[PDB]
Amino acid sequence: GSSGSSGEDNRRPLWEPEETVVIALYDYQTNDPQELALRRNEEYCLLDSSEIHWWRVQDRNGHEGYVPSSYLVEKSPNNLETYEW
């Protein structure tokens, strides 16, 4: 392989390392308005974890609702030296 215009991959993220960002392992679907359909391999801003089985999140476009925390996952840690004790 060979580069073309730029040989330096500087693809920075969008969300913030401070806000809780979760991702859906699978594309969840529902027939209720109160519920939101998650997308496989898609991050989501955690609004409030009031409940346990159901977490309130928001899409990148602006779609919030109740989703199965099971699908949502905590963006694995990286280059972060911190201990929760």
Task: Provide an overview of this structure.
This is Tyrosine-protein kinase ITK/TSK. By secondary structure, the protein is mainly β. It has a domain at 20-75: SH3 Domains (SH3 type barrels). Helix content is 0%, strand content 28%. The protein contains no helices and 5 strands. A 5-stranded antiparallel beta sheet has the order 4-3-2-1-5, with no helix packed on it. Strand 2 (42-48) and strand 3 (54-58) form a beta hairpin. The radius of gyration is 16 Å and the shape is globular.
Please give a quick description of this structure.
This protein is mainly β and 85 residues long.
Write the layout of secondary structure elements.
Layout: E1 21-24, E2 42-48, E3 54-58, E4 64-68, E5 72-74
Antiparallel strand pairs: 1-2, 1-5, 2-3, 3-4
Protein name: Tyrosine-protein kinase ITK/TSK
Modified residues (Phosphotyrosine): 26
Subcellular location: Cytoplasm; Nucleus
Determine the fraction of residues in helical runs and give it as a percent range: under 10%
CATH class of the domain at 20-75: Mainly Beta
Label the CATH architecture of the domain at 20-75: Roll
CATH superfamily of the domain at 20-75: SH3 Domains
- First-residue to last-residue Cα separation: 46 Å
β-strand percent reads 25-35%
* Strand segment tally: 5
Report the sheet with the most strands, covering strand number, pairing sense and barrel closure. 5 strands, antiparallel
- Strand/helix succession: EEEEE
Structural class: mainly beta
CATH topology of the domain at 20-75: SH3 type barrels
Radius of gyration based on Cα positions: 16 Å
Strand arrangement, major sheet: 4-3-2-1-5
User: What general form does the structure show?
Assistant: globular
Q: How many distinct helices? A: 0
Protein name: Tyrosine-protein kinase ITK/TSK
Family: Belongs to the protein kinase superfamily. Tyr protein kinase family. TEC subfamily.
Organism: Homo sapiens (Human)
Subcellular location: Cytoplasm; Nucleus
